[PDB]
Design an enzyme around this catalytic site. Structure first.
Site, PDB file in Angstrom:
ATOM      1  N   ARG A 120     -27.139   0.209  26.752  1.00 26.13           N
ATOM      2  CA  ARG A 120     -27.783  -0.761  25.835  1.00 26.13           C
ATOM      3  C   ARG A 120     -29.123  -1.334  26.253  1.00 26.13           C
ATOM      4  O   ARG A 120     -29.766  -2.010  25.459  1.00 26.13           O
ATOM      5  CB  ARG A 120     -26.787  -1.867  25.477  1.00 26.13           C
ATOM      6  CG  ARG A 120     -25.672  -1.380  24.577  1.00 26.13           C
ATOM      7  CD  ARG A 120     -24.698  -2.470  24.289  1.00 26.13           C
ATOM      8  NE  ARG A 120     -23.827  -2.698  25.439  1.00 26.13           N
ATOM      9  CZ  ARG A 120     -23.021  -3.742  25.559  1.00 26.13           C
ATOM     10  NH1 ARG A 120     -22.936  -4.626  24.582  1.00 26.13           N
ATOM     11  NH2 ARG A 120     -22.230  -3.858  26.618  1.00 26.13           N
ATOM     12  N   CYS A 180     -20.620   0.506  25.631  1.00 30.42           N
ATOM     13  CA  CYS A 180     -21.771   1.376  25.850  1.00 30.42           C
ATOM     14  C   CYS A 180     -22.606   0.863  26.980  1.00 30.42           C
ATOM     15  O   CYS A 180     -23.125  -0.263  26.955  1.00 30.42           O
ATOM     16  CB  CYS A 180     -22.659   1.475  24.588  1.00 30.42           C
ATOM     17  SG  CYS A 180     -24.268   2.330  24.814  1.00 30.42           S
ATOM     18  N   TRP A 207     -28.971  10.089  25.067  1.00 27.17           N
ATOM     19  CA  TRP A 207     -28.885  11.145  26.084  1.00 27.17           C
ATOM     20  C   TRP A 207     -27.675  10.921  26.994  1.00 27.17           C
ATOM     21  O   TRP A 207     -27.113   9.825  27.039  1.00 27.17           O
ATOM     22  CB  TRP A 207     -30.141  11.193  26.925  1.00 27.17           C
ATOM     23  CG  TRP A 207     -30.601   9.886  27.486  1.00 27.17           C
ATOM     24  CD1 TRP A 207     -30.131   9.254  28.642  1.00 27.17           C
ATOM     25  CD2 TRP A 207     -31.634   9.043  26.968  1.00 27.17           C
ATOM     26  NE1 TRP A 207     -30.816   8.081  28.847  1.00 27.17           N
ATOM     27  CE2 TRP A 207     -31.750   7.930  27.850  1.00 27.17           C
ATOM     28  CE3 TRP A 207     -32.489   9.116  25.845  1.00 27.17           C
ATOM     29  CZ2 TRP A 207     -32.701   6.898  27.643  1.00 27.17           C
ATOM     30  CZ3 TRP A 207     -33.429   8.073  25.635  1.00 27.17           C
ATOM     31  CH2 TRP A 207     -33.524   6.991  26.544  1.00 27.17           C
ATOM     32  N   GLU A 254     -20.289  11.895  32.021  1.00 26.69           N
ATOM     33  CA  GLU A 254     -19.683  12.343  30.768  1.00 26.69           C
ATOM     34  C   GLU A 254     -19.430  13.841  30.727  1.00 26.69           C
ATOM     35  O   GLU A 254     -18.399  14.253  30.227  1.00 26.69           O
ATOM     36  CB  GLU A 254     -20.492  11.966  29.551  1.00 26.69           C
ATOM     37  CG  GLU A 254     -20.941  10.454  29.486  1.00 26.69           C
ATOM     38  CD  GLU A 254     -21.844  10.213  28.276  1.00 26.69           C
ATOM     39  OE1 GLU A 254     -21.325  10.342  27.134  1.00 26.69           O
ATOM     40  OE2 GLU A 254     -23.046   9.865  28.444  1.00 26.69           O
TER      41      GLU A 254
HETATM   42  C1  HEM Z   1     -29.500   6.343  25.150  1.00 24.63           C
HETATM   43  C2  HEM Z   1     -28.610   6.619  26.103  1.00 24.63           C
HETATM   44  C3  HEM Z   1     -27.127   6.227  25.987  1.00 24.63           C
HETATM   45  C4  HEM Z   1     -26.273   6.299  26.995  1.00 24.63           C
HETATM   46  C5  HEM Z   1     -26.580   6.783  28.446  1.00 24.63           C
HETATM   47  C6  HEM Z   1     -24.987   5.879  26.489  1.00 24.63           C
HETATM   48  C7  HEM Z   1     -23.845   5.850  27.273  1.00 24.63           C
HETATM   49  C8  HEM Z   1     -22.596   5.652  26.775  1.00 24.63           C
HETATM   50  C9  HEM Z   1     -21.367   6.010  27.410  1.00 24.63           C
HETATM   51  C10 HEM Z   1     -21.303   6.718  28.792  1.00 24.63           C
HETATM   52  C11 HEM Z   1     -20.370   5.621  26.583  1.00 24.63           C
HETATM   53  C12 HEM Z   1     -18.846   5.727  26.774  1.00 24.63           C
HETATM   54  C13 HEM Z   1     -18.611   6.963  27.629  1.00 24.63           C
HETATM   55  C14 HEM Z   1     -17.686   7.838  26.845  1.00 24.63           C
HETATM   56  O1  HEM Z   1     -18.200   8.644  26.049  1.00 24.63           O
HETATM   57  O2  HEM Z   1     -16.463   7.706  27.012  1.00 24.63           O
HETATM   58  C15 HEM Z   1     -20.950   4.993  25.416  1.00 24.63           C
HETATM   59  C16 HEM Z   1     -20.259   4.456  24.346  1.00 24.63           C
HETATM   60  C17 HEM Z   1     -20.843   4.027  23.176  1.00 24.63           C
HETATM   61  N1  HEM Z   1     -22.205   4.076  22.857  1.00 24.63           N
HETATM   62 FE1  HEM Z   1     -23.717   4.522  24.131  1.00 24.63          FE
HETATM   63  N2  HEM Z   1     -25.099   5.536  25.134  1.00 24.63           N
HETATM   64  C18 HEM Z   1     -26.418   5.741  24.806  1.00 24.63           C
HETATM   65  C19 HEM Z   1     -26.973   5.553  23.552  1.00 24.63           C
HETATM   66  C20 HEM Z   1     -26.334   5.010  22.462  1.00 24.63           C
HETATM   67  C21 HEM Z   1     -26.819   4.910  21.111  1.00 24.63           C
HETATM   68  C22 HEM Z   1     -28.189   5.409  20.551  1.00 24.63           C
HETATM   69  C23 HEM Z   1     -25.872   4.299  20.414  1.00 24.63           C
HETATM   70  C24 HEM Z   1     -25.902   3.954  18.911  1.00 24.63           C
HETATM   71  C25 HEM Z   1     -27.037   3.503  18.381  1.00 24.63           C
HETATM   72  C26 HEM Z   1     -24.739   4.071  21.267  1.00 24.63           C
HETATM   73  C27 HEM Z   1     -23.571   3.451  20.915  1.00 24.63           C
HETATM   74  C28 HEM Z   1     -22.396   3.551  21.587  1.00 24.63           C
HETATM   75  C29 HEM Z   1     -21.151   3.138  21.003  1.00 24.63           C
HETATM   76  C30 HEM Z   1     -20.908   2.481  19.615  1.00 24.63           C
HETATM   77  C31 HEM Z   1     -20.119   3.455  22.066  1.00 24.63           C
HETATM   78  C32 HEM Z   1     -18.608   3.188  21.965  1.00 24.63           C
HETATM   79  C33 HEM Z   1     -17.927   4.533  21.675  1.00 24.63           C
HETATM   80  C34 HEM Z   1     -16.430   4.350  21.652  1.00 24.63           C
HETATM   81  O3  HEM Z   1     -15.983   3.164  21.540  1.00 24.63           O
HETATM   82  O4  HEM Z   1     -15.668   5.371  21.747  1.00 24.63           O
HETATM   83  N3  HEM Z   1     -25.038   4.537  22.511  1.00 24.63           N
HETATM   84  N4  HEM Z   1     -22.317   5.018  25.587  1.00 24.63           N
HETATM   85  C1  J14 Z   2     -25.031   8.249  21.584  1.00 26.13           C
HETATM   86  C2  J14 Z   2     -24.181   8.429  22.811  1.00 26.13           C
HETATM   87  C3  J14 Z   2     -24.806   8.694  24.019  1.00 26.13           C
HETATM   88  C4  J14 Z   2     -24.030   8.864  25.161  1.00 26.13           C
HETATM   89  N1  J14 Z   2     -24.617   9.122  26.351  1.00 26.13           N
HETATM   90  N2  J14 Z   2     -22.682   8.791  25.085  1.00 26.13           N
HETATM   91  C5  J14 Z   2     -22.017   8.536  23.925  1.00 26.13           C
HETATM   92  C6  J14 Z   2     -20.484   8.455  24.009  1.00 26.13           C
HETATM   93  C7  J14 Z   2     -19.595   8.984  22.877  1.00 26.13           C
HETATM   94  C8  J14 Z   2     -19.263   7.795  21.974  1.00 26.13           C
HETATM   95  N3  J14 Z   2     -17.826   7.590  22.076  1.00 26.13           N
HETATM   96  C9  J14 Z   2     -17.180   8.464  23.030  1.00 26.13           C
HETATM   97  C10 J14 Z   2     -18.229   9.533  23.313  1.00 26.13           C
HETATM   98  N4  J14 Z   2     -17.796  10.713  22.598  1.00 26.13           N
HETATM   99  C11 J14 Z   2     -16.698  11.510  23.140  1.00 26.13           C
HETATM  100  C12 J14 Z   2     -15.416  11.454  22.311  1.00 26.13           C
HETATM  101  N5  J14 Z   2     -14.479  10.472  22.838  1.00 26.13           N
HETATM  102  C13 J14 Z   2     -13.192  10.857  23.408  1.00 26.13           C
HETATM  103  C14 J14 Z   2     -12.467   9.662  24.041  1.00 26.13           C
HETATM  104  C15 J14 Z   2     -11.641   8.929  23.003  1.00 26.13           C
HETATM  105  C16 J14 Z   2     -10.284   9.233  22.873  1.00 26.13           C
HETATM  106  C17 J14 Z   2      -9.505   8.575  21.918  1.00 26.13           C
HETATM  107  C18 J14 Z   2     -10.082   7.614  21.088  1.00 26.13           C
HETATM  108  C19 J14 Z   2     -11.437   7.303  21.220  1.00 26.13           C
HETATM  109  F1  J14 Z   2     -11.979   6.366  20.419  1.00 26.13           F
HETATM  110  C20 J14 Z   2     -12.221   7.958  22.176  1.00 26.13           C
HETATM  111  C21 J14 Z   2     -22.784   8.334  22.763  1.00 26.13           C
END
Ligand code: HEM
Ligand code: J14
Ligand code: HEM
Ligand code: J14
Ligand code: H4B
Ligand code: H4B
Ligand code: ZN
Lengths: 407, 411
Positions: free
Chosen positions: B111, B108, B280, B285
């Site tokens: 953070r 993420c 947000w 994304e």
């Molecule tokens: C506040 C603005 C935030 C931004 C801009 C952000 C951005 C991102 C992005 C761009 C990703 C991976 C991109 C994708 O979806 O492939 C990600 C993954 C992640 N985010 Fe954040 N995030 C935010 C907030 C949070 C919050 C509130 C949490 C939980 C409290 C969080 C927890 C995580 C986790 C656990 C992942 C890993 C998801 C995975 O492994 O598939 N994020 N974040």
């Molecule tokens: C809270 C928050 C904010 C933000 N800006 N952004 C996020 C990313 C979400 C979390 N984690 C991916 C994003 N959600 C999209 C779904 N993921 C497809 C890619 C994928 C394919 C196969 C397995 C796998 F685990 C993931 C969360």
């Protein structure tokens, strides 16, 4: 033990068995992944020779043959008496080709089997080395129709008699610190440039001055040589739509030719082994021109396009970056010098990957390096799980000679 | 033992000691790096070590380690575990737990914001209807009419693994996908199967390109139930370009609230299997992945067509040109409607600052390079040039299988 890799765009799933034939260490453990880190005797040599000859004779469909066993005894008899040994020509070509086949950071490996190998093991002096290198450059360049090649100098002996090309690439631009404060030319090559000057080079002190070669034979003090300017094919950089682009005064060389790596075959180490192929476009447009630590020209270009540089959210860097890279590909093509674009390179590598899984049971690959430094997710490699592991024969990094060699 | 990471753009070197506090495995060995692989009932025995470990962490952060009140809490958790085989987190421990899972989320890039998480405690919830209401309130609070606020909602923990709370949606707000008999899909192709599921649970599909899916909600290990999110609560943004006026005719919109609802929150050994959280968007994304993946809305061709690019050779970089314009459009649309969004230059830069600060105060920042570097314009962001160490801290967010693959239906 067996491992699956999935492509997340096509759902295609592959099984890797080749990693069990893997030998060296990755840097990673069960507790920490080091995937993003750039650099993480008689008794020793014979296992290494054996493992290599075993794969060699197996590749020619002669595993466990008389010719196999006999060669194994001969190398053993040479090791026990001389504390090293000599590769046959055929083994050397196979070794080099496989070192490339095994280079987990190379997107260009679909071509691995066409490597032209130049055997320079009879070389003894820096003038000798210079001659071999000019023949390499001229052969590889082929007037713009580039061909893959490697030139192999004599192997390490006692480590006091090393052959080294001190340049990191055979063709690179110089770097000068200015009283002004900033940098003229390539800031990557500033140190080496000063070592050229301190060794007696007359530097023209401009932006695109081709560096002289620094060549070290048999552990001797290294010697300067300018590459015949007629052998250094360069491309002036213009844009197919933007007329003003030419007056940035950009040019790049056609031949990428890595010269600081160490080739290891069957435990034998070849410390001077320059190889060359051809460019993927992003190597020049994205990294060489746009890296903050390189020519760093994004600022100047965006200004010429009249983009809004008030805020990062106009994506002006991204817009300028695309055009720069369009200009690079255009220039090379218009001058008929081989170059591949990142879409084309990555598609070929996916084809290569699937070839290697079906034909070898795997393909070591370093995702961090294979994914191009722009437009990553719109290339098929982004969506491709890869396994990274170290097979031998291989190219390895080695410390810079100037940190090491004594005068 | 101390590990160094180098930034190759600035030559800044940082020293990691935090990886010493790492427990779970990474998937990697001395012999193989699995750094690019996407996915590589507990006993009393193991449970108290995990509790103790976590409470030791908790009480260290409030500067109460070894205090009478720290000791008393250990003994009380201890007893609760042997008497009941589980335990209950205090409010302050839950909060703290939730903030640290985010903080330890190495994939993420967002953070820098970790300490500002709004935690909602929904551990008194008992039914699906209860869950809908908690989630609606979540969405409303987090949305805040465009001025997005981070939030997590936490439902009761797993007990025997037979009484699980699950949100079957992967995100609280997502668009339907509908595969047609001709082979094409209408809508978000990622959601085809979850859509089919909603359909057969009784959702009557509108069948357009942008239908907001209903919430499918399991309480207490029961079969889950359908619920429409109230449309007034779903903030959406129509997509237009600042210079190209044909861009709106493409008919694109996206929702403003990204809210992940499929992850498992592990704290001190307890498993919270419904903990939807939301932040947000970073603009890429939507513009790179949601629109331009071949497996998603796949609009690159259509956009490059309308831009009259040379499309007959990939070497014109027509894909790269269209991709930048779409991403310009996404950031432009959000900003104009005053919906919070962050561009990838700004987000990666803030993350580098977060990361250096974390090395100074915490002794480390676990980060996954493959995920942190944005899917366009990689090397012109400062993260590309940052070496990173990836390892697993708890508390953490984990993947869990899809509920329809494991659920025992009752009827
Ligand atoms: C506040 C603005 C935030 C931004 C801009 C952000 C951005 C991102 C992005 C761009 C990703 C991976 C991109 C994708 O979806 O492939 C990600 C993954 C992640 N985010 Fe954040 N995030 C935010 C907030 C949070 C919050 C509130 C949490 C939980 C409290 C969080 C927890 C995580 C986790 C656990 C992942 C890993 C998801 C995975 O492994 O598939 N994020 N974040
Ligand atoms: C809270 C928050 C904010 C933000 N800006 N952004 C996020 C990313 C979400 C979390 N984690 C991916 C994003 N959600 C999209 C779904 N993921 C497809 C890619 C994928 C394919 C196969 C397995 C796998 F685990 C993931 C969360
Ligand atoms: C034929 C066209 C070739 C292409 C398009 C190509 C492409 C690339 C690219 C893009 C990289 C990453 C480079 C960087 O960003 O610094 C790379 C690395 C590498 N290539 Fe290839 N290459 C080609 C030929 C060759 C040949 C002929 C060899 C050896 C015979 C080779 C061996 C290597 C090695 C060892 C690396 C890793 C270098 C390092 O770790 O720093 N390449 N290649
Ligand atoms: C043969 C060939 C063909 C081709 N198209 N492409 C290549 C890439 C070369 C290899 N290796 C550097 C690339 N050239 C880029 C020059 N920068 C130095 C790279 C670097 C940065 C940081 C640490 C380090 F050790 C090295 C080779
Ligand atoms: C195979 C590869 O690891 C996979 O496609 C990853 C790469 N990096 C990613 N990074 C982010 N942020 N999101 C993703 O979905 C992915 N996909
Ligand atoms: C920190 C990171 O490992 C480093 O910047 C890498 C990332 N990927 C790369 N990929 C390629 N092809 N070439 C490089 O020089 C780098 N640099
Ligand atoms: Zn690893």
């Amino acid at each position: 033990r067996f491992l699956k890799v999935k492509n997340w765009e096509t759902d295609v799933v592959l099984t890797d068995t080749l990693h069990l034939k893997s030998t060296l260490e990755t840097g990673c453990t069960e507790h920490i992944c080091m995937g993003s880190i750039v650099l993480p005797t008689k008794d020793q040599l014979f296992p290494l020779a054996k493992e290599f000859l075993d794969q060699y004779y197996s590749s020619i469909k002669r595993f466990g043959s008389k010719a196999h066993m006999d060669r194994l005894e001969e190398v053993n008899k040479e090791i026990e008496s001389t504390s090293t040994y000599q590769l046959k020509d055929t083994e050397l070509i196979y070794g080099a080709k496989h070192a490339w086949r095994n280079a987990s950071r190379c997107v260009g490996r679909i071509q691995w089997s066409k490597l032209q190998v130049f055997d320079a093991r009879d070389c003894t002096t820096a003038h000798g080395m210079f001659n071999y290198i000019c023949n390499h450059v001229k052969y590889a360049t082929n007037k713009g129709n580039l061909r893959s090649a490697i030139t192999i100098f004599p192997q390490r002996t006692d480590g006091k008699h090393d052959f080294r090309v001190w340049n990191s690439q055979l063709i690179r631009y110089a770097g000068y610190k200015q009283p002004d404060g900033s940098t003229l030319g390539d800031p990557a090559n500033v140190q080496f440039t000063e070592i050229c000057i301190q060794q007696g080079w007359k530097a023209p002190r401009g932006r695109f001055d081709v560096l002289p070669l620094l060549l070290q034979a048999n552990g001797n003090d290294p010697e300067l040589f300018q590459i015949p300017p007629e052998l250094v094919l360069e491309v002036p950089i213009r844009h197919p739509k933007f007329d003003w682009f030419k007056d940035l005064g950009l040019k790049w060389y056609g031949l990428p030719a890595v010269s600081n790596m160490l080739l290891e075959i069957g435990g034998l180490e070849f410390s001077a082994c320059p190889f060359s192929g051809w460019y993927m476009g992003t190597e020049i447009g994205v990294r060489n021109y746009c890296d903050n630590s390189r020519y760093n020209i994004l600022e100047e270009v965006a200004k010429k396009m009249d983009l809004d540089m008030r805020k990062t959210s106009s994506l002006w860097k991204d817009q300028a970056l695309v055009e720069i890279n369009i200009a690079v590909l255009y220039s090379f093509q218009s001058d008929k010098v081989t170059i591949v674009d990142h879409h084309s390179a990555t598609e070929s590598f996916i084809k290569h990957m699937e070839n290697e899984y079906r034909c070898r049971g795997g393909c070591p690959a370093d995702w961090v390096w294979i994914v191009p430094p722009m437009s990553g997710s719109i290339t098929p490699v982004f969506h491709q799980e890869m396994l990274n592991y170290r097979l031998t024969p291989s190219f390895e990094y080695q410390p810079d000679p100037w940190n090491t060699h004594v005068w």
